[PDB]
Symmetry: D2
Subunit: 208 residues, 4 copies
Amino acid sequence: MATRSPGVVISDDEPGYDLDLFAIPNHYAEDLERVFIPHGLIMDRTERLARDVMKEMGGHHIVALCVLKGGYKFFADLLDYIKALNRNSDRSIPMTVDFIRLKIKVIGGDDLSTLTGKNVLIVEDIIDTGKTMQTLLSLVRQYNPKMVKVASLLVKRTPRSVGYKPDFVGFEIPDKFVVGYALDYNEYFRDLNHVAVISETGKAKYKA
Amino acid sequence: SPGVVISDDEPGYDLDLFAIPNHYAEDLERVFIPHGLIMDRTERLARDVMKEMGGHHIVALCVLKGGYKFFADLLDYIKALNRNSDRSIPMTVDFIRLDIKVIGGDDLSTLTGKNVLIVEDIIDTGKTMQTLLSLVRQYNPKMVKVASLLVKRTPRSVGYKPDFVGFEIPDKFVVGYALDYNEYFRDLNHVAVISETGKAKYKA
Amino acid sequence: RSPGVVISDDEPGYDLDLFAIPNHYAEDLERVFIPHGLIMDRTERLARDVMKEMGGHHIVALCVLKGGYKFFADLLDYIKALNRNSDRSIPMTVDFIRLDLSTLTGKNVLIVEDIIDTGKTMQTLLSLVRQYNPKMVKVASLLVKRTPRSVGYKPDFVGFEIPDKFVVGYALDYNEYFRDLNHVAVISETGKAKYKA
Amino acid sequence: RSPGVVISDDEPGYDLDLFAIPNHYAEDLERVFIPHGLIMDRTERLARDVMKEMGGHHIVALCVLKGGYKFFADLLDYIKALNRNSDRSIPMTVDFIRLKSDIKVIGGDDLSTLTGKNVLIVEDIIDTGKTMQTLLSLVRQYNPKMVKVASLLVKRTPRSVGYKPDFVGFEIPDKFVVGYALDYNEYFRDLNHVAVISETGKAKYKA
Ligand SMILES: Nc1nc2c(ncn2[C@@H]2CN(C(=O)CCP(=O)(O)O)C[C@H]2OC[C@H](O)P(=O)(O)O)c(=O)[nH]1
Ligand SMILES: Nc1nc2c(ncn2[C@@H]2CN(C(=O)CCP(=O)(O)O)C[C@H]2OC[C@H](O)P(=O)(O)O)c(=O)[nH]1
Ligand SMILES: Nc1nc2c(ncn2[C@@H]2CN(C(=O)CCP(=O)(O)O)C[C@H]2OC[C@H](O)P(=O)(O)O)c(=O)[nH]1
Ligand SMILES: Nc1nc2c(ncn2[C@@H]2CN(C(=O)CCP(=O)(O)O)C[C@H]2OC[C@H](O)P(=O)(O)O)c(=O)[nH]1
Ligand SMILES: [Mg+2]
Ligand SMILES: [Mg+2]
Ligand SMILES: [Mg+2]
Ligand SMILES: [Mg+2]
Ligand SMILES: [Mg+2]
Ligand SMILES: [Mg+2]
Ligand SMILES: [Mg+2]
Ligand SMILES: [Mg+2]
């Protein structure tokens, strides 16, 4: 089946789910408004992305690059599904991993010369304006990878977007601020499996 | 009304967004309830069940065949609670096929004095569970409760509602997650709607 | 053929305190014998062996209740995972039997059991199934005991070959208890007396 | 007080042919040493131990990259499962650091963020224990409320300076192991089991 896709499209008027339908951390009981993307649905979509990734990139050594901090959950789960494929199939390919954090200035990570001649998969939590990815791609290409692709859990529909589109997309979401599944608000809500929308009292509670 | 409400106009998801068995590729129309969503809802139901029933030995009764997946997953989440909490209760299990006649379980004297949890895939008219409940009460359980993954909004309902509900769904035929169409589609993780060519292929 | 993961007669098992155990069985178990996760790892490999050997024709998976139900559910979950992530897939239907089967005729029948001890139950079961004209019959058993009481029957797929010891857990019961336990374990003296029939 | 699951010096591990293994590592591994699922079962219990000791106050969970990233993700998943199914839970924030040779810390938030917090350092393996002593000495300059260390693996080795972590998955022989994000020259991180490398594998992937 097809490997390029705009992702699961979540509409502008998506109501999400009452928190009382799900198991939610107690300490965030009053801080969230709605569950927006259930953890399980993220897992289902990520399973299919892993297959799409192996189809496009499985022909040569893959370097999977995790963009910290918010990419870490998507990265771990995506790679677990890729590993499941590679131990149950006829063919497989080695995969190495690295981690970078952005200040854009690139923090941590291996020497980027280790990307040379490899199939590089950049893994991100969200594309909003896309400026971060564009600057990051422009960097990585200078090391002459055999290919560079971007997997992003979330892509926002926003008038501030520039036209950048990643190669693999989990969900295309409206222009709302979401948290959970490692996406934070002032470092909070990373310890939440679902993607959710913050309540005004949660926004006020954890404001810097 | 107390479960996850899926509306009549729910469009579901394109098959191409998910991992789908090849042999059902032409036979399904849409994914209706993704497997992971069933899991998330089932996690919360497990907790609801322990809260109401965990005071006394539980006998969990799986209604075959369609009940088997929900049953195994619900009980896994209940086990996960019980091995990570301060207190828990023994649970024993039995399996039946469907006085209403009950095929293949233990003597129903095993229910006497127990907290009995009946586990179904779906409630539609509600007659099956009404009839099964009428029989079960005669064995004097301590309590009897029903958990159903799905409940249909149907005008043919006799007004029976279960105690625990995963999803309230439209009056549409669904398959997947052990729900079949002529024994097919049980080997599918998601709840889905069958395509026209799918109906024709597997028609009995 | 694979004989399964061989568990030695002297296998010490694991201290219960190193694992998550349901509180209601804390005094009733002696040791963890096969951790639940190891069961999953082995079952994942068996699912692949099953699909390589049987995946050419429609499969009917037949669960032997009650004890086979956890192994059955997990094994079929791993086979479904294979079937939705490969080019090669085959329809599977399911049925249950407790110790009509028109569900079996002309299909590749996979019988799923918790444990083979003497093998007499399985030989009797196999004799019945053959009468429904299946295309193929194979048997997957989570556990096979090493025992001189055996009549020589060996399943096609085996998870673990274990000593002649009474085990519980992962749907293996003692007077219907311990089915609600993820690990395979050995029962304590307290447990044997408490749940004795 | 638990020394962890003790894996003895003579334990033979498991035939590779009994598990699902990526084919690109088929000749490169000798035996499966600790099956992925056993790691999961042990990690579940650790998460409960951690919540019992640390759950009274906001936890900052510190991942020591790269090798600790799998243990870290899984351990936090089990802690999240406790927190969404209990009445009692506490927030957790996270941070990631890399250590580079003594050692300096790379990446990370300002260590001031650790002041007054319950700090949980998550590591893949303790061998001599010098790395953890170093990281602890740094962390302790910022006066955390408490600091604890969870390590998946601890080696039995004469070279130990005597440091013992607070939570331990497995106590293993002095053998070089790979898998579950532990590497040999960056390979084998993409393997779910912990395994011992073959002589072939050592020669194939040698720097
Ligand atoms: N929790 C949340 N975070 C969001 C959201 N939209 C954007 N963002 C991002 C906020 N960001 C960060 O906090 C970066 C550091 P972190 O990964 O958490 O350690 C980056 C924003 O992501 C988009 C890219 O910057 P760009 O595409 O270049 O515009 C959102 O709806 N929820
Ligand atoms: N796959 C599907 N099955 C459905 C559907 N609605 C009803 N049913 C059920 C058809 N049924 C069976 O096939 C029973 C045997 P099985 O569980 O498959 O081994 C029973 C129906 O469930 C509802 C009860 O009968 P009742 O509440 O008394 O009306 C549906 O939308 N999809
Ligand atoms: N919990 C345990 N059960 C065991 C054990 N060894 C045998 N058995 C079996 C006892 N059995 C049952 O309880 C059958 C009913 P159930 O599946 O629990 O609904 C059958 C025994 O399995 C072996 C076959 O009989 P056979 O190969 O013909 O000798 C054991 O070490 N632990
Ligand atoms: N794959 C493996 N790695 C090992 C093993 N014993 C040690 N080590 C470690 C080698 N190390 C690294 O490769 C650090 C970089 P990374 O986390 O992989 O990005 C550090 C060693 O861990 C122990 C500490 O150094 P210390 O307690 O201070 O002696 C082993 O049996 N297998
Ligand atoms: Mg990001
Ligand atoms: Mg952020
Ligand atoms: Mg039913
Ligand atoms: Mg049916
Ligand atoms: Mg049996
Ligand atoms: Mg029995
Ligand atoms: Mg380390
Ligand atoms: Mg290393």
